[PDB]
Nucleic acid binder design. Structure first.
Ligand SMILES: [Zn+2]
Ligand SMILES: [Zn+2]
Lengths: 254, 243, 179, 258, 246, 258, 248, 179
RNA sequence: CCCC
RNA sequence: UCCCC
RNA sequence: UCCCC
């Protein structure tokens, strides 16, 4: 805690000179790395490293009852465990604040962009539908697990195989995916932004903004977080930058 | 469902840039330090502020400032289908972002080792309940005399049949293309900055910026109602003394 | 209209001096609380619609004894007379033996007792307390033996249950449920 | 620390009690002003706000089709819950119901169940498959004492203004929940060998030692609950029994309205 | 069941004013400061007292008196269909009133900053189990030598076919018109006051007052049984102190 | 605080151990007096009280029709739970199963399961539909050491005196549960390179360092569990393996109603 | 679906012999934020371990005046098993965590860090038979990587029993349809098996079979142990070359 | 190869004297940690692949003021410079008015305030601290009033929004985000 | 439930 | 077993 | 999974 303050000093000093501690440009993501199929046995899965931040996402699929509301669609459920494994900070307990938030943001990107055609996941309408469990497991917390997890999740969905034969539902086949939600989080410090905050940068405080776009560059979800006032001009700017970064991130999928 | 907009008019009769009927009343609770009851469309909401009070136990005590707690909670009977009591992911999320909005505003350095607790209960839910709540909370804080940079005022903008719509109702939320809650700090009588921002859906980059302008206009309107409500209270405390 | 909402602009930092209810930012003065803006001698203050009480020298105060050392009574000060709202600066106050009675009081234990409820006047920073005035002193004491609420007997406290008797700096309000 | 103001208030209450008075001038068998306001939550199938002195409570009723209990098909179901929410008292804490909350809800539930206020046989949809479930949820708004009686009042009032939501579950036409009794509870603070009907929060500073008696419309006793750590004198209980039945008759009158 | 009373006899052969069979045994547990095993009709209950001990956690501590805790718990196998373990609302309610019944009697002022813990376990349940437990707990407290103003004695009164019955059985509970548990403080060999009172059902005012008289008659009878369990315990410690001497 | 008497008692046990003796004169492979009382809970389907020295525990069995497991549509179900309630031992706290309590129930379950003491396939009522579920519920009364072996004994005794409740469930005549093996567990306290079979509570003052071995009818080992923070000498383990199989056999012969 | 056989022509379903381990991979220092870590594969098991300590009080009351406390948490990720498993501890994970902790309490020199905690987390990313043995191996590597003083190393394998035959390091099929399963862990000191740190078994084995299983497991344990040593040797080379990497 | 694993036999107790990274049992020395075995002057030690920092007389330390006394000040020592790993002997270290500037400071609150992040050197057991060095002293101070982080200006510290100024033993690194 |  | 309220 | 046990 004492160290975080001092490091906070160092981060702000370089901010004043308009430069990040590691020389990235204020609009520059760290090195991204997407490894699919890291968990055979899972129907889909992917590991993402973003700088020194590491996250794995497993996808599981099983038949089940559809929610009374919508008897004509499959289901997607997203959870996260920020296990004490990733840092001396995470606690063994049940899904806390941050973890619920991280998982909901990832879910919204996927849901609002309609990446998965929930209608194709019906087996017997009003009785039988596919349930897609998307589980996020943090490994190493070096900042912005949010963007890493979002990347990791869509990769894993894109690498998912529907286990039809297992359930006597006919041949296995790829989960049809029709969009690529990518999210972009920046640390806001006064009137300045730092795209893809490192954990070291996060020493200034947990004041961030996250924007999530689709295939065609439409915004599909956003989320401001932390105890700070967001300036509207900054927002306008960061909107375009964020759409920009998402487009660049998207090509790592091709 | 079939159509959301017919001839410039929404399902309930409103124009693209019209609030639902609002009602705001300060000091409705004897036991709280500040309170507000607030209607927004079919939303019925009540906020209570306790504090600055001593924090329990102590593993939550902060030596430099005060701590802010906020709890959004829905009564079982406030939704179409009886909701089982207790926390809830959406609720937990809403409480977090709601508390973050007031941390940016309450002068928390004024009260070290103290807590300022804010409770908001939705007695009847419709679309934008979190928005109703943030409005009430702000009024309750003012009612309770806790120093703040300015007001918090909140509204959501929706998107329906391709069109931005201020303060969506249930059906618009359910069948629209987007939904975007806002809250602003109000200082010098104007929208200064953004205290809360969330969006779910599908919106062009311009639609988003347009949605902000639409939100700010609604906010200013709501802010004035918040003000009159505090003004009545101010008259009431003076009348009290004159007794 | 003198009424101001929090966030209402009062003027430049150089026009007026910051007083209670007003805050300084970017060279400007703003209202922090709703209420009546008042300016006197260049000083801007807002009289809040809901004042948060602050304990100061001269205030009257209700408290409980949480610890007795040898020449010192540690008082849990919780309330400021005349105001129901919890004081901003609730805390531990100190009652030295000097200020108990303005007489001679060897042990502070002859005047105040563990868990006694008590009425005092603040006479210094950090909640420095006195009980010298006749109006000040203990308001409610429990029997050391059976923990029964002591009853005032002339100018002495006596347990009505075990009959024990104890002596303290009794306030004139003892047992009245008022202070 | 909050104890301190309360201990002093206690001395004040006891001092007046010693002189045969209550701090607000009420008689010992006298209720504060009661206000009963139906239909305050439109979405709910039924609802009521009750003001008892400055104590305020809202009760909502929700109905929905459900499995009957294996032990008793041919029987609708009623489930009562209370939230004594931090929004009501500086001492209500966010979390699952404490004992108090469980106790309050159960006493309310007991009045309704033992008086058979609601004909549960008529809430049967299918033999042993489908039956109406009645959720009664008590939400405390402002605790200035005796949330218990305020809640009993609001609960029976809300049931009395309850519309069975038939034409939403396609079970036919909407009809009013048939209510055939009017349970009313009367709670008193016992202090030594005295009682104070309808205690205020201030009065409660003396301690949490109460007696609640609940009656039906014919003055039968349908529920009773002694609560708190004290000994109840039998003779006092006898007097308080006749008094309570009487008080409940008067309250019951407030349901005519005219 | 057709009728609960026929020719003035109950389903089990009891008269309106007659207790079910009772067994009370003190000192049945080695690892507890006081204890009692108790059967009341088909109820089998076991009660255990620990204290005055130190209070954990250090913050539930009361600087002026002992705190009393009381847990009533139904073993999973004690009922007709297996009961999922863990407290429910009813058990919590029962634990609370039972606690309050003893808060009234235990001389807690003697043991500042302490706890006196009472655990009562129902191994087989029938009607009136909370009454069976209070009786056991009270014995267990006396077995533990914890100072009390007098005894706690408990029985319920029911109403069946319009008639008041002492100590209802299961069928009477479920199919009768009312159930009303009492517990009394007994001092100077007499009923002194009411430590616990609850009721559900439908009784006239006259029935309520009559119920009290019936309960007191039954409580006195049970009280002699509690005394006798304690008397045996007294005899047993004395003749053991002779065993060493022997 | 509690630690202090225990620590001193630890010195006493260790002192005796140094002179090759136990506290109460038992041999190092000698159980205390065992008593097995079946049918102590008539309302249960099966039940047993076991006394192991001053240690006491009761186990009850309950059976009800229910859902088979998707993976095992042709097998009845056995579920074992333990409550180590505050009633037994001042050390036992209130709450969901402690890890101690979860461990104990699982050892007992492993013995019963892996010995195949109960023919599960004979507890099928309707493949994939209806199958018997056997609840084994362990309830400590008096902890004077080795609740584990006491429980294992009580659990199998209870199973051996269980009566399937077919009638109650309109499913035919009632019948005795078919039990085809007799799992018995033997638990030793390990102190250094010495073992003490069936440790008393006083002996446990030394530390919570034990070894449990369970055998079936034919002396096959069917479950084993080392517990506690110690290192187990392999030579000691070999010797104790033999001693335990033997002890288990003697124990097993007490079920001859003897 | 029950294989019916399990052992054919002295070969198991996956091709190995009665005394052969599954393929194993061990890597130390794979996590930036932990004091020590290890990624470990063991057949289809994929696990990761992390160590933090000596640190903390902590919380407060838990602290032990005379010595450190050890915590070990075994946790399976929802996607590590065949049917997605609801997150949170179950009784099995609780039991595995307790006995795992116990294995290390026997070996960490906790007296060196009074009023401290040394925390051990292990995550099953992909589960197969023996995941508890995999975690124990990964955890001992992580402990060494974090430099926490120990009597020696902890090494772990299970012996199964299939078609009447003892097998080393069972796979899922042999676990599910075999006759017995018996995880061990040993203290290795002076390059050899010094004692038993963890022992559990379920199924049906003869007294003689139990004794032979111990022999089999020790053998496999010595094989795995050399892998652990190698993995740490590599790490040793890394802090070495990355040191004078600064002075270069 | 000098590499060792924990458990590895080094030698006999008599042969060598147990040093760091080694323990004894039944007369034999073993490696407690992985790393390099070193034997100099009969002393056996193992240089650990991951040393656990020990704060000893002479180390440079990073701490925060948690309590102020008259002449004594309590500083929570949290790091040892040159080593990222948390030291095993974290704790409370007493700083005295004498060991501050090599000059004279009556008010111990004249150099080190509450919650101040500080940089000190160890001078005695028990984490006895001192900052009589130019390189030592407060690195990051908060205003007593607005609690705002004070910026450095020449040889003094001023609140960039309250203006009010406080003075204290300023470390040459104050505000550098480095120590 | 047990195995994972 | 989600998501909106 | 309410109410009784
Ligand atoms: Zn007395
Ligand atoms: Zn300042």
């Amino acid at each position: 805690d004492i160290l975080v303050d001092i490091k906070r000093d160092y981060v702000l000093s370089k901010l004043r000179d308009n430069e990040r501690i590691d020389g990235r440009g204020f609009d520059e993501f760290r090195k991204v790395e997407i490894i699919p199929n890291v968990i055979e046995k899972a129907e889909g899965s992917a590991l993402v490293k973003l700088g020194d931040t590491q996250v794995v996402v497993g996808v599981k699929m099983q038949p089940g009852e559809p929610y009374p509301d919508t008897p004509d669609r499959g289901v997607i459920i997203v959870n996260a465990e920020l296990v004490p494994l990733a840092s001396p900070t995470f606690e063994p307990g049940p899904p806390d604040e941050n973890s619920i938030e991280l998982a909901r943001v990832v879910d919204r990107g996927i849901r609002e962009s309609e990446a998965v055609d929930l209608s194709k996941l019906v087996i017997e309408e009003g009785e039988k539908v596919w349930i897609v469990f998307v589980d996020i497991h943090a490994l190493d917390d070096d900042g912005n697990l949010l963007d890493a997890s979002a990347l990791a999740a869509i990769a894993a969905l894109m690498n998912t195989k529907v286990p039809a034969e297992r359930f006597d539902l006919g041949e296995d086949y790829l989960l049809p995916v029709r969009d690529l939600p990518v999210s972009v989080t920046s640390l806001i410090v006064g009137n300045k932004y730092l795209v893809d905050p490192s954990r070291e940068e996060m020493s200034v405080g947990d004041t961030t903004l996250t924007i999530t776009t689709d295939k065609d560059d439409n915004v599909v979800a956003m989320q401001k977080s932390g105890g700070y006032l967001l300036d509207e001009k900054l927002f306008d700017e960061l909107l375009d930058v964020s759409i920009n970064c998402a487009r660049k991130l998207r090509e790592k999928f091709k | 469902p079939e159509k959301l907009i017919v001839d410039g008019l929404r399902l309930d009769g409103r124009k693209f840039d019209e609030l639902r009927p609002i009602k705001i009343e300060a000091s409705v609770l004897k036991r709280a330090d500040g309170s507000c009851y607030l209607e927004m469309g079919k939303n019925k909401v009540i906020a209570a502020v306790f504090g600055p009070r001593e924090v329990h136990p102590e593993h939550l005590q902060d030596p430099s400032k005060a701590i802010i707690r906020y709890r959004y909670n829905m009564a079982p009977f406030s939704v179409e289908e009886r909701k089982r009591p207790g926390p809830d992911r959406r609720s937990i999320e809403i409480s977090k972002v709601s508390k973050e909005a007031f941390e940016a505003v309450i002068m928390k350095e004024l009260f070290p080792r103290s807590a300022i607790d804010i409770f908001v209960e939705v007695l009847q839910a419709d679309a934008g309940s979190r928005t109703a709540c943030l409005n009430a909370a702000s009024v309750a804080l003012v009612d309770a005399g806790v120093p703040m940079k300015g007001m918090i005022t909140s509204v959501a903008v929706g998107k329906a049949d391709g069109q931005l719509v201020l303060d969506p109702m249930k059906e618009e939320d359910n069948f629209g293309e987007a939904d975007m809650p806002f809250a602003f700090l109000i200082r010098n009588g104007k929208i200064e900055s953004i205290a809360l921002l969330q969006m779910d859906g599908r919106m062009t980059r311009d639609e988003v910026k347009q949605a902000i302008e639409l939100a700010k206009k609604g906010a200013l309107q709501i802010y004035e109602m918040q003000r009159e409500a505090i003004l009545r209270r101010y008259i009431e405390v003076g009348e009290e003394m004159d007794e | 209209m003198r009424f101001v909402m929090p966030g209402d602009r009062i003027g430049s930092a150089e026009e007026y001096v910051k007083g209670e209810g007003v805050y300084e930012e970017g060279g400007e003065l703003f209202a922090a609380v709703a209420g009546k803006l008042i300016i006197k001698d260049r000083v801007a203050k807002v009289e809040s619609i809901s004042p948060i009480p602050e304990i100061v020298k001269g205030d009257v105060v209700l408290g409980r004894v949480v610890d007795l050392r040898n020449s010192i009574a540690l008082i849990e000060v919780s309330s400021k007379k005349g105001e129901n709202r919890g004081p901003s600066n609730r805390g531990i106050g100190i009652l030295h033996v000097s200020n108990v009675d303005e007489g001679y009081v060897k042990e502070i234990s002859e005047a105040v007792g563990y868990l006694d409820i008590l009425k005092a006047r603040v006479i210094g920073d950090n909640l420095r307390l006195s009980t010298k005035e006749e109006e000040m002193g203990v308001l409610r004491a429990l029997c050391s033996n059976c923990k029964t609420e002591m009853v005032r007997e002339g100018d002495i406290l006596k347990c009505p249950e075990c009959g024990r008797v104890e002596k303290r700096k009794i306030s004139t309000d003892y047992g009245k449920g008022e202070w």
